[PDB]
Symmetry: D3
Subunit: 322 residues, 6 copies
C-alpha cells in the first residue's frame, strides 16, 4: 500500500505524545485518513480501500488505552466500508473518507463546546475546583463557568511523569482564571477546601469505570471520602464498545525514561525497575456524574450510551480488517 507520509508522521507523533489528549489524538487520526484519501494516487476503489485499511491499522497500533482513537477510525471506516461494498466508484469512495473524517472532526469540536455549557451549570460562584492532567473537555467546563462571571479558582495537580498540569495551569491562567498548582501527593491535603473535582477520560467502560491519566483514581477516592463531587467531562466517543462484550482495557506502559531521564537512569543499579503506567481505573462508585455532549448521566448509564450508539457494530469485524 502507498501510504502517505502524513499518516506515518501522525502515527509517530501520537506514539511519542507530541500529539496527546484523547480527543485530539482521535481528531488527528481522522485527519490522517482524510489526507490519505485526498492525496491517494490510487486509480481503482479496491486500491484506495486497501490504503485506508492499512492506514487505519497503522494509526490504531500507536497507543492502546484511549478508545477515542479507534472510535474515530471506526466512524470513518464504517462509512467508507459501506460505500465500498455498495459499489462506490473511486471518487465517491474518496469523498466518503474525506467527508466522514471532516464530520468526526467537526462533531468532536461541537461536543467539547456543549460539554462546557452543560458542565458549567454545575459549577457555582466561589467554587474551588480540582482537576488532573490536561483534558480539553474538563477545561471547557472551567472556562465556560468563568465566562459566565462565576469567581472560581482551579487547583491543578502536577500530573507526573509528563507534567501535564503545567499545560493546564498555563492554559487556564491565560483565560484569566486564578490557578493553584500542587504536586499530585497534596491532593488529599487540599480536598477539604475543594468544592468540585472535574476531570476528563480516555475510556469509559460498560460498567461505568473511567480510565484516565495515572492518578485520577486517587483523587476520585479522596473526593468521595470528603463528599466532594467528582464530574467526568467526556465525549460519547470516549465510551468503549468492546467492554460490553467483556473486553478489558489495556493500560499503556510507557518508556521508563519518561520518569527518570536516560542520563540519570543508566547510572542506577540493575535491581531497580521503573514502572510507568499512563492510566489508572476509577470505579464508578467514586464518580458522581459523566457529562457528555448529550447530557448528564450517572456512571451506571454508560452502558446506555454504548448500547444505543455503538452496540450495532459489535456483530461485525473492525471495518479496517480483512
Amino acid at each position: 500500500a502507498m501510504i502517505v507520509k502524513e499518516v506515518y508522521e501522525t502515527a509517530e507523533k501520537i506514539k511519542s505524545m507530541e500529539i496527546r489528549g484523547a480527543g485530539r489524538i482521535a481528531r488527528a487520526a481522522a485527519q490522517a485518513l482524510m489526507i490519505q484519501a485526498e492525496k491517494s494516487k490510487a486509480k481503482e476503489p479496491e486500491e484506495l480501500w486497501n490504503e485506508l485499511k492499512v492506514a487505519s491499522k497503522i494509526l490504531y497500533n500507536t497507543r492502546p488505552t484511549a478508545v477515542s482513537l479507534p472510535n474515530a477510525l471506526r466512524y470513518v471506516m464504517h462509512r467508507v466500508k459501506a460505500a465500498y461494498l455498495g459499489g462506490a466508484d473511486l471518487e465517491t469512495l474518496r469523498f466518503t473518507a474525506i467527508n466522514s473524517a471532516k464530520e468526526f472532526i467537526y462533531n468532536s469540536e461541537k461536543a467539547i463546546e456543549r460539554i462546557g455549557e452543560i458542565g458549567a451549570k454545575r459549577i457555582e460562584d466561589g467554587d474551588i475546583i480540582m482537576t488532573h492532567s490536561h483534558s480539553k473537555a474538563a477545561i471547557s467546563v472551567m472556562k465556560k463557568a468563568f465566562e459566565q462571571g462565576k469567581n472560581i479558582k482551579v487547583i491543578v495537580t502536577e500530573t507526573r511523569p509528563k507534567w501535564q498540569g503545567k499545560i493546564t495551569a498555563k492554559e487556564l491562567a491565560s483565560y484569566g482564571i486564578p490557578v493553584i498548582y500542587i504536586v499530585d501527593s497534596a491532593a488529599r491535603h487540599y480536598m477539604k477546601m475543594t468544592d468540585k473535582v472535574v476531570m476528563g477520560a480516555d475510556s469509559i467502560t460498560a460498567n461505568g469505570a473511567v480510565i484516565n491519566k495515572i492518578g485520577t483514581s486517587l483523587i476520585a477516592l479522596t473526593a468521595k471520602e470528603h463528599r466532594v463531587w467528582v464530574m467526568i467531562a467526556a465525549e460519547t466517543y470516549k465510551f468503549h464498545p468492546a467492554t460490553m462484550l467483556g473486553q478489558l482495557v489495556e493500560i499503556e506502559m510507557r518508556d521508563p525514561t519518561e520518569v527518570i531521564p536516560e542520563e540519570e537512569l543508566r547510572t542506577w543499579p540493575k535491581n531497580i525497575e521503573v514502572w510507568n503506567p499512563a492510566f489508572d481505573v476509577t470505579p464508578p462508585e467514586y464518580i458522581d456524574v459523566i457529562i457528555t455532549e448529550r447530557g448528564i448521566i450517572p456512571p451506571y448509564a454508560a452502558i446506555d450510551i454504548l448500547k444505543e450508539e455503538f452496540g450495532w457494530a459489535l456483530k461485525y469485524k473492525e471495518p479496517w480488517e480483512d
Copy 2:
C-alpha cells in the same frame, strides 16, 4: 551570646534540607548543642547556660513540623537546666550538655535498630512492600526483613517535590533489595499487588494521627481501602507532647521553587500560585500499628507513649525559655 559557627551551619543545613529526615535533624540539633558546649569560651555557668538557651532557640526556629527536633533539644536542655538550677559549676554544666547530647544520639541509633527488629517480624517471605519518602526507621524494617532471608520487593514512590524516593530506591538497592520505582500518582494502581505499607513519621499526635511527608495520607487511605496493612515506624521522640494539651501541629510550607525551578517559575503568569506543603496528616483510622523501639501499638495508644514519657514536662516552660 557567643554562638559557635557549627550551630549556625547546622541551623542553615536543616533549613535548606541539606540535612533531613526527622531523626537525623534531631541528632544534628543535639550534636550542635554538644559542640556549643565543647567549644564555649564562657567562664561562668550563667554564660554557658545563656549560650545553650540561645543555641536551642536558633535550632528550634529552623523547621517546625517534625517534633523530633524540639524533643531532642528538650532531652538535652531539661538536664542542662536542672544541673544549672541545682548550682552546677561551669565544667559540670558543660559536661551535662555534652553527655546528654551523646545519650540522645546513641539512644536514637539504638531505637532505630530495634524498630527494625520489631517491624521485620511483621514482614513475611514473598511480601511486596510499598513505602513513601525516605525514612531511616522504615528502611530499618525493610533491611532487617531482607537480612533474615525473606524475599521481598519494595515499591518506592517518587515523593515529589524533593524526589526523596530516589534516595530510598538507591539505598534499598544498595543492600540487595529489588526495588520498583513509581510516581506518587500510581500508588492506588499498585495497591492491589502490595502486601504491606511501611512509612515513617515526623510527628505523632495524642489522638493517634501521623504527620509525615506530603502524600502519606493518600497512600494510607487507599491501603485501608484495599485492606493492606499500614505500619508506621517511629521512635518515641516522634510523639508530640504539646498535642496532649490541644496544640495543632504546624504544616511547614516550603519555597515554591522546590516545585517549579526559579528559571521556569519567573516566566509564569502572576495568577498562578504554587503551594508546597511538606507534610500531610493521616488519621489514625488508616494506620494499623505504630512500631516504636518499645513495641507495637495501635495508633490510639500514642497518648500512652506521651503520658508516660513526656506529660511531666507540660507543667513547665520550654527548658530553653527565660
Copy 3:
C-alpha cells in the same frame, strides 16, 4: 392580561404553604389554569393564549424546588401551545387547556393510588416503617399495606419547622394505623427497630438524587448505616428534566419567622441569623428504590424516566415563554 382571581389566590396559597405537598401543588397549578380557561372572556385565541402564558408565569414563580409544579404547567401548556400554533380557534384552545388540566389531575390521582399498590408489596407483616414530612405518595404505600391486613406501625418524625409530622400522625391514625411520634433528632436512635423507611420526593435529578423535605438526607444516611431499606415514593412528574442538561435544583430558603416566631425573633441579638432551607439533597447511594406509578426503579434509572418522558422538550423553550 385579565387574570382571574383564582389564579392569584392559588399562587398566594402555594407561596404561603396554605396548599403544600409537591403533588397537591401541581394539581392546584393545573386547576388554576383550568379556571383561567373556563372563565376567560377572551374573544380571540391570541387573547386566551396570552392569559394562559401569564397565568403560567404567575404559577411558576411561587415555589422553586418541587419540579412537580412546572411539570404540571408544561403538561397543560405544551398542549395548549401546540393547539394554538396549529391554528385552533377560541373554543378549541379553551377545551385543550381545560382538558389537558383535567388529564393531569386525573393521572396524578391514579399515579398515587398505583404507587400505593406497588410499594405496599414491599411492606411485610409486622413491619415498623419510618417516614418523614407528609407525602401523599408515601402515605398511599402505608395505607394500602394496612388495608391488605399487614400489622404495621409507623414512626412519624415531627418535621420541623412546619410540624408536617403532626399532619402525618393524625392522617395515619385516622386510617387505624398505630403511630409513634418522635422528634427529628431521634431518627438514629430508633433506626435499630425500624424495618423500612418510606419517604416522598419534590424533585429527582438525572443522577438519581432526591430532593425532599429538610432532614430527608439524614434519615436516609442513618438508614443506610443500619441497612434499612430506603424507599422513595414518587410520581414520574417528580422527575426533573433540566437536570439532564446540567441544571442545579434551587433549594428554597423560607422565612426565618417560620422557625422562630416574629414576636420572639425580634428580641434576639442581631449577630444571630436563622437559616431555613425547606429541602435537602439525598444522594442516590442512600436510596434503595424509587417507586413510580410505572414500577420500582433503582435511583440510577432516574435518567431513563427523564429521557423517555421529558427529553424531547429540552430543545424547546418553556411553553409559556415569548
Copy 4:
C-alpha cells in the same frame, strides 16, 4: 386432568433437588411440557390446553425462588396461549408447545456458552477465582478462561448444607483446572489472595439485587471489603419481572433434615430449631457486573433487561391461569 408421569416425576425431582441449578430446572420444566404435548391423547385443542395449564401449575409449585422456572413456563405458555386463543387446531397447538419448549432449551444452552465467552474475557492469566455453590453459568466462564490458556486456580467453597462445592470442585478439576476447596467460613480468610469472585444467580430483581445460594451475600460483602471484583454469570431468564411491580422474592426454607440428618435430629431437644434458608439476597452495591448472554451490565441495569424483555407481560395474568 390427564397428566403424563414425566410431569410428575420432573416435579418430584425438582422438589427433592435430584434435579437442581436454576437453568437446569428451567430446562427440565420446558422438557416436561414438551413431553406432555408429545404424549397427550387429547382429541380437541381445549383438552390439550387444559393439560398444559395443569402441568404448568404442577411444575410452578415445586420450588419458588429461582425465577428461571416460571420464566421457562411462561416462554412456552405465552406462545401456547396465543395459538389456542387464535384458533389453532389440535396439531398446531401441540407443535407450538413442543417447539416453544425446544426453543427455550436451545436458547438456554447457547446463553450459557455465550456467558462463558463474554465472562472469560474478564479473567486474566494467573487469576485466583473464588466461586460458591455450583452454577453452570459461572463454570462456563471459568472453563472457557482455561481453554483460552489462562492459568487460573479456583477457590471453591463447600456450600453447606447440600455440599454443592464438591460438585463444583470435581467438575472444574476434570477440565484441568486446579482447585482449592475450603469451608464457607474461610471465604474472608482467603479473600486477600483472590483476584475475582464469579458466582451465579437464581433471581435478579428490578433494583439490581441478586438472589443466589445461601452465603453468596457474605462472599460478596467481604469481596467488596477487599476490592475484589464480584461478577455474577446469569442468563436473561434469571431476571425477575414481578419485582418491577414491587413483588418480594420468596426465599425457600428447606427441610431441616438436610442440615442435621433425621437420625441425629430426632435425638435433639425440642428447644433447638434448625432453620434452612436455601438462598440469600446480595444487594447491588456488592456486585460489580452481571454477565448475561447479551453483554456485561452494571446491576442497576437489571431494570433495562426487565423492561425490554419482560415488562409487556405484566398487564396479563400468568399464561397458565384460567
Copy 5:
C-alpha cells in the same frame, strides 16, 4: 429522716429540668448535700450520716442518664463515709461533707475553664463550628477561641424538644460570636460548610461511647461522613465507672407533653404514642477527640480515665447505701 427543704427543692428542679446541664446538675447536688450538712440539727454523727445518705438517695433518684450526678454524690459521700467509719465526731463529719462538696464545685468550675483553654487550641481562625444542645463545656471552648481573637461562627442546632439551642444561640451571641440557628434536620445540609463539631456529654462509657442530648449521634454520623472533626468537651466526672463492669447506661424517657403540649396532646387519638428519649448514644468510631481537664484523648482512652480515677470504688457499694 430530717431532710432540709433545699434537698427536696433541688431534686424537684433537677427533675423538672428547671436546673439542667450535666455539670450544673452535679454542682447542684453537691450544694444540696452541703446545705443539708450546714443546717442539720443532728446531735450525733450517726444521725448526720443517716441524713446525708437519705439526701443522697433523694438526689440520685432524680434523673438517671448523666453520670455527673452520682459522681458528685460519690465525691462527697466516699469522703463522708470514710470519716464517719474512722470515728469522726459530729463537727468533723459536718465539715467533711461541706468541704468535700465545696471541692467538687470548685474543681468543676476549674475543669470547665481548663477544657476551654485546651479545646480552644483546636479551633482555628475562620472556623465554622457546629454544636448541639447547650453544654457549658463546649461553650467554654468556643468562648475562649473567640477571646483569643479567632474569627469563628457557630451553627447552633435547635435541639428539640426543649429548644436548648435557643439558650446556646443567645449565650454565644452575648459574648460577641456570630451564630447561625438551624433546625436539627438541617445538620447534614450544613455539614459541607462546617469545619468542626463541638458538643458536650452526659456520660462517657468504658468503650468510648458518648451519651449526650438526643440527636448528637446523628450530627456525629454525618460529620464523620464529611470528614469534619467531632470534638467532645467533657470533664472527668462525665466518665461512667459502672460501665467498666458491663453496666448499660439508662436512657431517660421524658414526659410526652414536652414534645406535644398537654392541650394539643389530649385531642389526639389513642393510637398515636409520643416517645421522648432525652439522649442518644454516639459510638466511638464517630468521635475524634474527647477534651477533658486533663488533656485531649481518643475516645478509646475513656477506659484509662475510668481505671486511674474511678476503678478503686467498684469493689464497694455506693457510699450512700446501708
Copy 6:
C-alpha cells in the same frame, strides 16, 4: 527425662482435639505439669526441673494458635523457675509446680464465671444473640443472662469443619435456652434479626485483633455492617505477649481429612487441594468490646492488658528453655 504418661496423653488429646477450647486446653496443660510434679521420682531439684522443662516443651508443641496454652505453661514455669534458681529443695520445687498449676486452674474457672456476670449486663431482655464455635467464656455470658430471667434466644452457627456448633446448641438447650441452628453461610441473612454477637477468643494481639475459630471475622464483618454489637468474651490469658514485640500469630492448618473424610478424599482428583485453617483474624474495627474478668475494654486497650500483665517477661527467655 522420665515423663509420666499423663503428659503424653494430654499432649495427644490436645493435638487430636479430643480436648479443645482455648481455656480448657490451658487448664489441661497446667494439669499435666501438676501430674508430672506429683508423680515424679526425681531425688534432686535439678532432676524435677529438667522434667518440667521437657513436659512443658512437649505441651507447647501441640497446637500453636491459642496463646492460652503457653500462657498457662508460663504461669507455672515462671514460678517453678524462680524457685529453682533461688535454691529451692525438691519438695519446695514440687509444691511450687503443683500449687502454681492449681492457682492457674482455679483463676481460669473464676475468670470465666466473672466474664459471665460482666457480659450478661450487656445482654437485654428479648435479645437475639448470635454466636459462633463453642466458647465457654461466651456461653458463660449467655447462660448468666438467662439465669437473670432475660428472655433470650441464641442463634448457633454450625462451625464447620468440626461442627462445634452442635456442641453449643445442645449445651445451651440443656440450660433451657431456646436455640436456632443455622449453617455458617446463613450468618448474613439472619444478622438483621440479631441484637448482639457474643464470641470467644484464642489469641488477642497487641493491636486489638482477635484470632478465633474460622469464620469469626465474617460474622464480625457483617455484624459491623448491620450495626450489631460484637462482643468477645476472653480471659486475660487469651492476650498474646509476643505480639507486643512484632510477632505474628501462626494460624494452625489442620488435616484436610477433617474437612473431607479420608474415604471420600482419596477418590478426588489430584488437582484439588483441601485447605483447612482452624482460625482467622478479626480486625479491631469490627469489635465493640472485649469482656475480660477485669472488665469491659475497647479492643485497642488490649496493649494495656499486655503491658500490665505480660510485658515484664519479654526481656527473658521462655521459662522452659535452656
